Structure formats: structure tokens, C-alpha cells
């Protein structure tokens with residue numbers, strides 16, 4: 001159906017009564033399509049609670065991860081919530097909110113497989129395109145091959161099939177995939193390779209919206225809504241401490 005692309009200030013958004021939110025929809029349990037083919041996840045619930053707290057009806061747009069930041073700047077959405085770690089490189093093209101969770105990238109291998117960055121010597125490592133996982137894998141020398149996937153669950157599929165030695169991904173995504181697929185006796189979570197603060201993104205220079213999102217997030221963290229949503233998803237509070 002197409003849409004009107006525009007980078008919108010907070011007051012322009014407020015006038016419309018609607019906030020357009022970009023996400024990926026292939027990164028469970030943060031944002032994904034469930035068994036009845038509807039968009040959900042910790043970040044969807046969070047996104048909706050943000051929209052609500054601002055007096056705005058959310059309109060969700062799922063699309064491939066590698067495209068999200070560039071379509072944000074082109075004006076397809078007002079903000080993106082799609083598990084983006086804050087990086088200096090990314091902050092050149094977008095403005096990040098205060099982080100809505102903290103986490104890290106972790107080595108995942110089959111039983112008896114690589115557990116440390118050092119173990120990745122002559123190994124084949126699977127990572128999703130445009131991610132901090134791919135970025136870190138590119139900097140670990142002596143990996144035989146960094147294999148890059150458009151979608152992160154595809155890397156998991158290749159780890160299981162034995163086409164790669166190691167998948168590097170988010171620690172919560174790794175834990176949940178193992179629980180979901182009952183892979184406790186088949187997969188092995190190794191070392192935390194790096195830690196990261198994960199945040200919403202706004203088009204570069206969209207300071208009015210940036211500030212409103214920060215305020216709404218602060219409010220959710222104070223009024224118990226964040227705690228409730230984190231509990232539902234993780235049985236614990238995942239905010240940066």
C-alpha cells in the first residue's frame with residue numbers, strides 16, 4: 001500500500017495522533033511473529049506502552065534488520081525498536097534513546113564445540129548481517145570464515161545442521177532458543193564476548209522525538225510498567241543497572 005515518508009517532530013506526530021514504529025520481527029523473544037502470525041515480543045509490548053504513555057496509537061512496520069536505520073532516516077517510521085546496541089558507528093547515522101535493556105553477545109556452539117574467542121581458531125562462525133555480532137566476529141582473527149546471514153534464526157539452523165561451528169548472538173535470544181527447542185543436551189552457551197546497551201533509534205537530528213521517548217521510558221521505569229513487561233518476558237528485570 002505504500003506510505004508517506006517523513007521525518008516528523010514530536011508535535012507533528014502528536015497532531016496525527018499516531019506513531020509509526022519500525023522493528024524487525026525475526027528476533028525472538030524481543031520482536032517476532034508468533035504462532036498465530038502476529039507481531040509480538042518484549043520490545044513490541046514496550047513500544048506499545050511507550051506509544052500509550054505518549055497518548056498515541058502505535059502503527060507497527062516490520063522489515064529486514066539491515067534496512068531499519070536507513071528507512072528510519074528516509075522517514076518510513078518515527079522510531080525503531082529492534083534490539084539495536086548503541087555503537088559509535090551507528091550513532092553517526094542515528095540518535096539513540098537511553099537504553100531499554102542491557103545484554104551481551106555470546107558464543108553458542110554444539111556440545112564440545114568452541115566456548116571462547118580463542119577456541120574460534122580455524123572455526124566457521126555464523127552471524128546476522130549488520131549486527132554487533134558480525135562486527136565482533138570480523139575482529140577476532142584466525143576465524144577461518146565469518147558466515148553472514150540475513151536472519152539470525154538462519155544461523156541457528158546452520159549451527160544445528162553442522163554447517164558452522166559457532167553462532168554468535170544475543171545472550172537472551174540464545175537462552176530462549178535452547179529452552180524453546182529443547183536443545184539443552186545439544187547446544188552449549190560459551191563466553192560473553194561483549195556487553196551492550198540496547199536502545200530505540202530516531203532519525204539523526206530528531207531531537208524533539210528523542211526527548212519525548214526518553215521521558216516516556218523514564219516514566220515506565222518509575223511507574224512499574226517496565227518492571228511488569230520485563231517480568232512477563234524474562235521473569236526478571238533486564239534494565240541497565
Ligand SMILES: NCCC[C@H](N)C(=O)O
Pocket residue numbers: 024027065082083084085086128130131132133152170198
Ligand atoms: N537483529 C537484531 C540485532 C541486535 C543486536 N543487539 C545488534 O545490536 O546488532
